[PDB]
Structure 1
Amino acid sequence: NQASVVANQLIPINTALTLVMMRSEVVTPVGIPAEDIPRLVSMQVNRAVPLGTTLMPDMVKGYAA
């Protein structure tokens, strides 16, 4: 099964991501894969990202395909 990224804690908007906030877990819809965890570090999202949220590439400003 394809795995994706998911929030681990209450991540506030306009904040930098970390290893704790990011994790591996299969969720739907499958957005960003688990093979980009060390690449999406210190990334600032353009919206509030609470616990249990499939980290997408469009939401992450700067993270492109």
Structure 2
Amino acid sequence: MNQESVVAAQLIPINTALTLVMMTTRVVSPTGIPAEDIPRLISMQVNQVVPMGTTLMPDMVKGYAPA
């Protein structure tokens, strides 16, 4: 019963096309984008230099949005 948020699997610079090799899941705080968006962030770049271990936010992804 833990919310798994997207976590920069590795260094992710600004305007970096997110990839399944650059994203992952991990219980972090505060929580950000849901792991259920993993396949959503894919192909989508970031609107900021997000370093590894840095939780992914819905306000840190370009062309992102809910459903």
The TM-score with structure 1 as length reference comes to 0.90
By how many angstroms is 1:56 displaced? 0.6
Amino acid at match of 1:39: R
- Deviation of 1:58 after TM superposition, in Å, equals 1.0
1:1-28 per-residue CA deviation (whole Å, 9 max, x = no partner) reads 1110001111121110100110011101
| Identity fraction in percent | 82
Q: Distance in 1 between matches of 2:4 and 2:51?
A: 19
Moved over 2 A (4+): none
Aligned to 1:32: 33
RMSD: 1.0
AA at the equivalent of 2:43: S
Aligned-partner SS, 1:6: strand
Q: Aligned pair count? A: 65
Structure 2: distance between partners of 1:55 and 1:36: 10
Note the residue ranges of structure 2 that are not aligned, 5 or more in a row: none
Q: TM-score, normalised by structure 2?
A: 0.88
Gaps of 5+ in 1: none
1:55 Cα deviation from its structure 2 partner: 0.6
Q: How does 1:10-21 map to 2 (within 5 A)?
A: 10-21=11-22
